[PDB]
Amino acid sequence: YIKGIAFDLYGTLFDVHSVVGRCDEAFPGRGREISALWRQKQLEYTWLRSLMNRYVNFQQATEDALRFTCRHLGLDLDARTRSTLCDAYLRLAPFSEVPDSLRELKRRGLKLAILSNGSPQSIDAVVSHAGLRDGFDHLLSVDPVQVYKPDNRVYELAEQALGLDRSAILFVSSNAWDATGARYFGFPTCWINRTGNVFEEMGQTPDWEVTSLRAVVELF
Amino acid sequence: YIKGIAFDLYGTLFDVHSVVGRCDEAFPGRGREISALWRQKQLEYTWLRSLMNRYVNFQQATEDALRFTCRHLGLDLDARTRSTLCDAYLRLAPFSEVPDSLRELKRRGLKLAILSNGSPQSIDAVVSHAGLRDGFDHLLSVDPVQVYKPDNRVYELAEQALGLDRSAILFVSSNAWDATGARYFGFPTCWINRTGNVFEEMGQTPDWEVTSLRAVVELF
């Protein structure tokens, strides 16, 4: 039986579409382009640095990813504007069903936690700004292990902090590549697919594929 | 002094634009889309499987990447068509300056080698079809180490096969992320940038940035 749930941050709980708008305000007409490439570089850099054994915290990785993005687009990025766009991640709005769903799952007595890339301080900030803080038992960052997902050492961390075995911790994520990693590790996996995307072809399939957190509650 | 050179395959020696056309013939009008996404998934899958410690040879990784690509685009991919597109990589044409440049570098007495993802048999096939076989001392695959780049264990392989120390082996590649990996490892790095792209923001800069192999010869 699942006694705890490990949540993903962007795309699972919080909507990042906010950042797109904040980018377009900085560089009018380019918003969708900037945010699209910026997000991919953030992913790539965490993966690539992990393979090379050259870690840096997510904040740095986010700035670097933006710097490359603008340089690649022919956009001039000053320090001031770079901080603003980066601060945009600390002010995300959750998906509509999120608040109620979290309250209901906590009612059911499940231990809830968040495992993200950023510092614990920033993770706290996002959930506090959204007034959701009180619903989480653990706020985890990959920083302690100096590596990023899907390196299995990040998953153990989630397992250790929760004081439960992986088979009793539901891994919830909107990223198929992450759900694949979790699935290989041992966590029962729940893929959050809202916009009709397909699963990655790396030998895995999630235990459950849902369209929102509303469906997650029904499982309990 | 550089006594040997380790070459990258696609984009450095051989032009992959050929595959784009072969894709468009299979799915008329979609060629650029298919090949674009297919190449990114190939990269991602090698990286992601390496981090998860779940290796499979490049052939499998190429098929999976195509399967996802078509499924994601709403395209129906049968076995027959899947093999054809995959065979397209074994029939690439080199860049115009390549042949002469390789002949000239061998004239200068440098040990030349290729370090790619595919099987040694397929690597051999590409260079043989292009009539370039005789110019290479070593044809290397990552298969022996069961991991992909930029995992440092792949770079050591290139170092061991050549019987030289890394500082005496020029690492030539068209991929900035790979040049970063090599650079961190210890290899003097030469980035081949033909189409005016920018370098990745992961803390590195190549020793040389050139626009073709013609410039590589001038360095010696």
Curated annotation (Swiss-Prot), chains A, B:
SUPFAM superfamilies xrefs: HAD-like
Region Important for catalytic activity: start-end pairs: 173-178
Impact upon substituting residue 175 to W/K/H/Q: Severe reduction in catalytic activity
Origin superkingdom: Bacteria
Its EC number(s): 3.8.1.2
Active site residues of this protein: 8
Claim: Lyase is one of the keywords in the record: no
Keywords per UniProt: Hydrolase
Biotech use, per record: (S)-2-haloacid dehalogenases may be used for the biodegradation of halogenated substances and their derivatives which are widely used as pesticides, herbicides and other industrial products.
Reported effect, residue 178 to N/E/S/G: Loss of catalytic activity
GO molecular function: (S)-2-haloacid dehalogenase activity
Effect on the protein of changing residue 116 to A: Severe reduction in catalytic activity. 25-fold decrease in substrate affinity
TM annotation in the entry: none
Residues annotated for an (S)-2-haloacid binding in this entry: 9-10, 39, 116-117
Catalytic reaction list: an (S)-2-haloacid + H2O = a (2R)-2-hydroxycarboxylate + a halide anion + H(+); (S)-2-chloropropanoate + H2O = (R)-lactate + chloride + H(+)
Record annotation: effect of changing residue 155 to C/S/H/W: Severe reduction in catalytic activity
Site (Important for catalytic activity): 12, 149, 155
UniProt keyword Hydrolase, yes or no: yes
InterPro entries: 2-HAD, HAD-like_sf, HAD-SF_hydro_IA, HAD_sf, PGP-like_dom2, S-2-haloacid_dehalogenase
Protein family (similarity comment): Belongs to the HAD-like hydrolase superfamily. S-2-haloalkanoic acid dehalogenase family.
Function: Catalyzes the hydrolytic dehalogenation of small (S)-2-haloalkanoic acids to yield the corresponding (R)-2-hydroxyalkanoic acids. Active with 2-halogenated carboxylic acids and converts only the S-isomer (or L-isomer) of 2-chloropropionic acid with inversion of configuration to produce R-lactate (or D-isomer).
Assembly information from the UniProt record: Homodimer.
Name recorded for this polypeptide: (S)-2-haloacid dehalogenase
Organism from which the protein derives: Pseudomonas sp. (strain YL)
